[PDB]
Amino acid sequence: EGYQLEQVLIMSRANLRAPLANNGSVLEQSTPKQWPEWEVPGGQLTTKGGVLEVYMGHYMREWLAQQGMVKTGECPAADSVYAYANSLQRTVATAQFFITGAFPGCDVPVHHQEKMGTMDPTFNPVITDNSPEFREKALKAMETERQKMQLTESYKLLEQMTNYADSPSCKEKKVCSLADAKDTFSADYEKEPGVSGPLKVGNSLVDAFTLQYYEGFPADQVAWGEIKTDQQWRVLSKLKNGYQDSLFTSTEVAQNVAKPLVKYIDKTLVTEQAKAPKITLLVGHDSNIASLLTALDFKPYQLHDQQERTPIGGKIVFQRWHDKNANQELMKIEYVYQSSEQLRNASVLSLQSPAQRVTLELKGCPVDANGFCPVDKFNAVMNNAAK
């Protein structure tokens, strides 16, 4: 009956979490205005984020079955499914909710490293090369990417929405402007690429608004009611997307930082394939998706009906399709995600009312008219990035 979906690996970020807005946090320091309250402490998933993942899980399960992988109504064979999350509350949580929605009533544990509350090396996008040539070249690549962006409109808008000149940052630390302030990038050995300055603050702020919107806060409680149009979202989102792009998206940085994740995905889909599950779920972070995508050299992609480049509840679904011979196998990779509205509305997902799907393309594995490329070339892409 032709090509059947034989193996999938799903790379996920955590779903909806509470912004961190307690005394002394970046959010609190960045405005004199009070933030609306959330149901859990900062950085913890919300219940709506779990329900959104349950819906994604159920949709995915339907879809997996539709493509021949394991049929609806029965648990998959033991050890058919392997769920591995970074060792943080929100990523373990998003895995539990996804796996429960997709595989209800089945014994599929979520795995994670022993120490909760700390970064697992698999998911920790840290710089591994201590040479000053790597650092100089990384810094120059971040600065170059940043220098292409026109952010002052975004910043002026944000200063007005937050009353930034009256915030604790301004009054106590004399950091009083977003639009005129200087970014400082870092590419420190054994840390994440970073930036300090307005871009980091604009990132934290716009992220908080995005989350309020998705969480379903009334319009008057999103950003104090100040974001009234998609156009405004678009202007503001330039900061959050520009932060991620600057840091995680240069070729120098990404290939280094995402090595343990690339290696994990190579092992699962290529080099230790005999033992691999039919379904792997990894749950990490936006920086992991951003650097992975750069490190495997995907072509440019655009996500319709989303303001985020790496959306809350958005997953990279790598798919190995098999008919009769392993050397005729095909690979197809899609970004499967909920639109900004499907998130805010908690939309019930189904085959008739699906998640959004965009097919992604590796530069090294050109796809046909239907998004498939030969496994032969996929394998070469992975080997080469995993070197």
Task: Give the annotated binding-site residues.
Answer: 13, 17, 22, 90, 203, 243, 285-287
Q: Within 226-330, where are the H helices?
A: 230-248, 251-257, 259-266, 286-295
d(CA 277, CA 109): 13
Under the binding rule (CB under 6 A), the answer on residue 285 touching ligand IHP is: yes
As annotated, the binding site for 1D-myo-inositol hexakisphosphate includes 13, 17, 22, 90, 203, 243, 285-287
Q: How many residues does the chain have?
A: 387
CB nearer to its own copies: pick between 256 and 288? 288
The count of chain residues that interact with its own copies, using the rule CB under 8 A, is: 32
Under the binding rule (CB under 8 A), the answer on residue 225 touching its own copies is: no
| Contact string 302-341 vs its own copies (x = CB under 8 A) | ----------------------------------------
C-alpha radius of gyration, the chain, whole number: 21
Among 12, 29, 30, 89, binds its own copies (CB under 8 A): 89
d(CA 324, CA 230): 48
Shortest CB 31 distance to its own copies, Å: 23
CB 186 within 8 A of CB 196: yes
- For residue 376, the one-letter residue type is D
Shortest CB 381 distance to its own copies, Å: 34
Residues that bind Ca ion (CB under 5 A): 151
Q: Would you call 297 exposed, middle or buried from its count of C-beta atoms within 10 A (0-12, 13-18, 19+)?
A: middle
Among 13, 309, 320, 332, binds ligand IHP (CB under 6 A): 13
Under the binding rule (CB under 8 A), the answer on residue 39 touching its own copies is: yes
Under the binding rule (CB under 8 A), the answer on residue 353 touching its own copies is: no
d(CA 207, CA 310): 12
Among 1, 24, 34, 105, binds its own copies (CB under 8 A): 105
- What lies within 8 Å, CB to CB, of 228 at 6+ separation is none
Chain residues 67-86 in contact with its own copies, contact rule CB under 8 A: 72-73, 75
Among 53, 120, 159, 192, binds ligand IHP (CB under 6 A): 192
CB 15 within 8 A of CB 39: no
Chain residues 150-179 in contact with ligand IHP, contact rule CB under 6 A: none
Q: In the chain, where do the E strands start and end?
A: 4-13, 81-85, 110-111, 184-186, 194-196, 279-284, 315-322, 330-337, 356-360, 373-374
Q: Which residues bind ligand IHP (CB under 6 A)?
A: 13-14, 17, 20, 22, 43, 88, 90, 119, 125, 192, 203-204, 207, 285-288
